[PDB]
């Protein structure tokens, strides 16, 4: 049988085994094709995927972050153009924007799953502090008042930090700013995706509101020294009253109960992100699938991609990974009425905004990770007291950098 090689980022608790279980129905019905997944850690994924494209030494297939798809597809001769080979009618239409290069009709990836970041909260902490999550998290300033009530209260054998978020360089630095900028009434780029615009008055108001939560003590300043993975573990250990995180954490916290007796999962809830003056907006992310032009099994690889778009494969990978499907028929399944999953679905469906699918965005995120993290260094007073004016200068500088890339 053809052994399709496939790179995946760590999308679930046991990524390789989980992937293999989801594709077992495919090999059952296609005995000539097996799948060998290889895990590629997120911090190395852009360099490794890019090196695979430029060198010609590549697997048959790789997962690609939705925001990077245009960058890899724009590399001449790197990927197989999928335009016309995939029935787009089956997909949630909003998920297709990242499969194309913006400004063209060229599709170089197939949507695989979507995700957004929602507001997890500890029910016991909110009940003690008199915080009512559905309404007290509904707006910027109601959220802020809620953090004031939650900060420092004693739950279990610890003093809880009201909000815990990472500040260290990783791909989520910009993602965690995104919906504060959108909700303030700003954006990262103009409609054409050719000019950076997040130094606008409204964009800065969202950057100022969010970053100054830590200056005011409502967001845990020491936690800014950590990355997303460390924040997710800390919240799983009960360190924070609230945190903005993706749905995948539900897998880890559920296993923590099954394996360690940590019942955190049973005393947490999730609400949509608070609404800003622009209305509610949320980060829309996810990953697509691509076929390398160097593959010697392009026919078999396309069959596997089509399987991953099937209703049952979309549901089963959602159940194990907690990512949201991109195929409309998958939402006929009652699984997405789950109390936690339904929140992510409603939020990304109604309010999810994705970045412009331009070839330069991958290089833009490299700069964002380094540039916007300097705002957190300003908050942490690494070099001098905090000042908003220094944040404005960082944002102006980062914007200039992005403008050179575009
Ligand atoms: O910006 C590049 C892409 O990022 C995607 O978000 C991913 C984050 O970059 C990544 O840090 C995070 O990693 C999770 C992992 O999914 C999970 O299995 C593990 O348990 O915890 C990690 C965090 O500590 O995963 C997300 C989602 O894959 C965007 O979705 C994508 O649009 C974007 O191109």
Decide the pairing of beta strands 118-122 and 240-245.
antiparallel
Contact 100, 129 (CB under 8 A): no
How much distance in Å is there from the Cα of 216 to the middle of ligand 1? 28
Per domain, the residue ranges of the chain are 1-116+283-357, 117-282+358-406
**Half-sphere CA count of 111, side-chain side, radius 13 A:** 28
Contact 206, 184 (CB under 8 A): yes
What strand order describes the sheet that includes 118-122? 161-163, 240-245, 118-122, 268-271
Residue nearest ligand 1's atom 24 by CA: 229
- Exposure of 246 by Cβ count < 10 A (0-12 exposed, 13-18 middle, 19+ buried)? buried
Picking from 350, 341, 231, 232, the residue whose alpha carbon sits closest to that of residue 284 is 350
Contact 342, 336 (CB under 8 A): yes
Decide the pairing of beta strands 282-283 and 352-353.
parallel
State this model's resolution in angstroms.
Answer: 1.7
Q: Which residues pair with 223 in a beta bridge?
A: none
Tell me the CA distances in angstroms from 9 to 40, 153, 314, one per residue in order. Answer: 5, 37, 17
Radius of gyration of the chain (CA): 21
Q: Helix, strand or coil for residue 162? A: strand
Q: Residue 39 and residue 45: Cα distance in Å, rounded? A: 10
- Exposure of 345 by Cβ count < 10 A (0-12 exposed, 13-18 middle, 19+ buried)? buried
Decide the pairing of beta strands 324-325 and 110-115.
antiparallel
How much distance in Å is there from the Cα of 238 to the middle of ligand 1? 22
How much distance in Å is there from the Cα of 29 to the middle of ligand 1? 31
Contact 202, 184 (CB under 8 A): yes
Query: Whose structure tokens read 């995939």?
Result: 86
Q: Which helix (H) or strand (E) holds 204?
A: helix 201-215
Picking from 167, 68, 166, 164, the residue whose alpha carbon sits closest to that of residue 372 is 167
Pocket of ligand 1 (CB under 6 A): 9-12, 42, 65-68, 115, 170-172, 228-229, 232, 246, 248, 285-287, 365
CA torsion sign for 284, 119, 164, 262 is negative
Secondary structure (DSSP) of 54-91? HHS---SEEEEEGGGHHHHHTSTTTB---TTTS-GGGB
| Long-range contact pairs involving 77-81 (C-beta distance under 8 Å, separation at least 24) | 77/293, 78/53, 78/54, 78/292, 78/293, 79/53, 79/108, 79/109, 79/290, 79/291, 79/292, 79/293, 80/108, 80/290, 80/291, 80/292, 80/293, 80/295, 80/298, 81/106, 81/107, 81/108
Tell me the CA distances in angstroms from 306 to 4, 7, 169, 180, 352, one per residue in order. Answer: 14, 17, 35, 36, 25
Q: Ligand 1 atom closest to Cα of 231?
A: 24
Q: Which residues pair with 115 in a beta bridge?
A: 285
Q: Which two tokens stand for residue 342?
A: 């339904």
Q: Phi/psi class of residue 286: alpha, beta or left (left: φ > 0; alpha: ψ in -120 to 50)? A: left
Q: Residue 64 and residue 62: Cα distance in Å, rounded? A: 6
Picking from 364, 366, 341, 392, the residue whose alpha carbon sits closest to that of residue 193 is 364
Q: Which two tokens stand for residue 120?
A: 């997890």
Angle, helix 172-184 to helix 361-371, in steps of 10 degrees: 90
**Residue 37's CB: how many other CB atoms inside 10 A?**
20
Q: Residue 242 and residue 274: Cα distance in Å, rounded? A: 13
What strand order describes the sheet that includes 2-8? 33-39, 2-8, 61-65, 285-291, 110-115, 324-325
Max distance between CA atoms of the chain, in angstroms, equals 64
**Cα angle 304-12-45, degrees, rounded to a multiple of 5:** 75
How much distance in Å is there from the Cα of 42 to the middle of ligand 1? 7
Decide the pairing of beta strands 2-8 and 61-65.
parallel
Q: Phi/psi class of residue 156: alpha, beta or left (left: φ > 0; alpha: ψ in -120 to 50)? A: left
Contact 46, 68 (CB under 8 A): yes
Mutate to test the pocket of ligand 1, among 41, 46, 65, 97 (most ligand atoms within 8 A of CB): 65
118-144 burial, b at 16+ Cβ within 10 Å, e below that, comes to bbbbbebbbebbebebeebbbbbeebb
Picking from 147, 209, 144, the residue whose alpha carbon sits closest to that of residue 181 is 209
Picking from 206, 228, 404, 287, the residue whose alpha carbon sits closest to that of residue 6 is 287
Contact 302, 319 (CB under 8 A): no
| Residues contacting 254, CB < 8 A, separation 6+ | 265
Tell me the CA distances in angstroms from 47 to 42, 320, 366, one per residue in order. Answer: 10, 27, 11
**Half-sphere CA count of 299, side-chain side, radius 13 A:** 4
Q: Ligand 1 atom closest to Cα of 65?
A: 34
Residue nearest ligand 1's atom 16 by CA: 11
Q: Residue 42 and residue 9: Cα distance in Å, rounded? A: 6
Tell me the CA distances in angstroms from 52 to 8, 61, 193, 372, one per residue in order. Answer: 14, 11, 27, 28
| Residues contacting 36, CB < 8 A, separation 6+ | 3, 4, 5, 6
Contact 156, 128 (CB under 8 A): no
Mutate to test the pocket of ligand 1, among 40, 42, 286 (most ligand atoms within 8 A of CB): 42
Q: Helix, strand or coil for residue 23? A: helix
Q: Residue 154 and residue 188: Cα distance in Å, rounded? A: 39
Secondary structure (DSSP) of 231-270? HHHHHHTT-EEEEEE-TTHHHHHHHHHHHH--GGGGGEEE
**Half-sphere CA count of 230, side-chain side, radius 13 A:** 12
Contact 72, 78 (CB under 8 A): yes
């Amino acid at each position: 049988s053809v052994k399709l090689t496939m790179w995946i980022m760590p999308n679930s608790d046991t990524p390789d085994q989980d992937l293999l279980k989801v594709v077992k129905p495919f090999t059952d019905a296609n005995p000539h094709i097996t799948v060998e997944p290889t895990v590629v850690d997120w911090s190395a994924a852009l360099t490794k995927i890019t090196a695979a494209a430029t060198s010609g030494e590549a697997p048959d297939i790789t997962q690609v972050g939705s925001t990077w798809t245009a960058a890899i597809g724009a590399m001449e001769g790197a990927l197989v153009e999928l335009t016309g080979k995939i029935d787009t009618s089956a997909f949630v239409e909003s998920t297709l924007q990242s499969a194309y290069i913006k400004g063209t009709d060229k599709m170089f990836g197939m949507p695989w799953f979507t995700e957004t970041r929602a507001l997890f909260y500890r029910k016991d902490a909110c009940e003690k502090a008199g915080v009512n999550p559905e309404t007290d998290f509904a707006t910027w300033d109601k959220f802020k008042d809620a953090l004031k009530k939650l900060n420092g209260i004693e739950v279990d054998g610890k003093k809880l930090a009201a909000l815990g978020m990472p500040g260290k360089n990783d791909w989520n630095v910009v993602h965690n700013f995104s919906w504060w900028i959108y909700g303030a009434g700003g954006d990262f780029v103009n409609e054409e995706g050719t000019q950076a615009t997040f130094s606008s008055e409204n964009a800065l108001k969202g950057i100022k509101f969010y970053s100054e939560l830590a200056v005011e003590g409502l967001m845990d300043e020491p936690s800014l020294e950590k990355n997303t993975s460390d924040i997710e573990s800390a919240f799983g250990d009960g360190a924070y009253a609230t945190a903005f995180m993706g749905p995948w954490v539900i897998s880890s916290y559920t296993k923590n109960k099954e394996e360690n007796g940590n019942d955190l999962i049973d005393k947490i809830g999730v609400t949509m992100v608070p609404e800003g003056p622009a209305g509610r907006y949320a980060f829309m992310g996810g990953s697509n699938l691509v076929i390398f032009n160097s593959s010697k099994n392009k026919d078999e690889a396309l069959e596997l991609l089509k399987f991953f778009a099937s209703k049952e494969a979309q549901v089963e990978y959602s159940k194990v990974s907690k990512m949201l499907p991109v195929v409309k028929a998958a939402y006929e399944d009652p699984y997405f009425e789950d109390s936690l999953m339904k929140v992510f679905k409603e939020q990304v469906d109604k309010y999810g905004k994705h970045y412009a699918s331009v070839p330069g965005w991958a290089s833009a995120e490299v700069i964002f990770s380094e540039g916007l993290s300097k705002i957190w260094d300003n908050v942490m007073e690494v070099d001098g007291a905090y000042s908003y004016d220094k944040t404005v200068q960082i944002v102006k500088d980062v914007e200039s950098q992005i403008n050179q890339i575009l």
